[PDB]
Amino acid sequence: RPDFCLEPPYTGPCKARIIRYFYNAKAGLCQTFVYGGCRAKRNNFKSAEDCMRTCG
């Protein structure tokens, strides 16, 4: 898998309430997190399917 799949989820500093998906390598699956709408890192997907396709 790409090494960005190992990053902790990153909310960033902005105030939005956007549900995104990150890969949790210890758990071996994607989970949801709240992204704040700026400064997204790479481990940040718009669906579980894209997250698992990229990082599974």
Q: Which residues pair with 29 in a beta bridge?
A: 24
Contact 35, 11 (CB under 8 A): yes
Method used to solve the structure: X-ray
Residue 21's Cα: distance from chain center in Å? 4
Report angle CA 24, 29, 36 to the nearest 5 degrees. Answer: 50
* Alpha-carbon separation of residue 17 from 7, 11, 12, 13 (angstroms): 20, 10, 11, 12
**Domains of the chain listed by start with CATH number:** 1-56 (4.10.410.10)
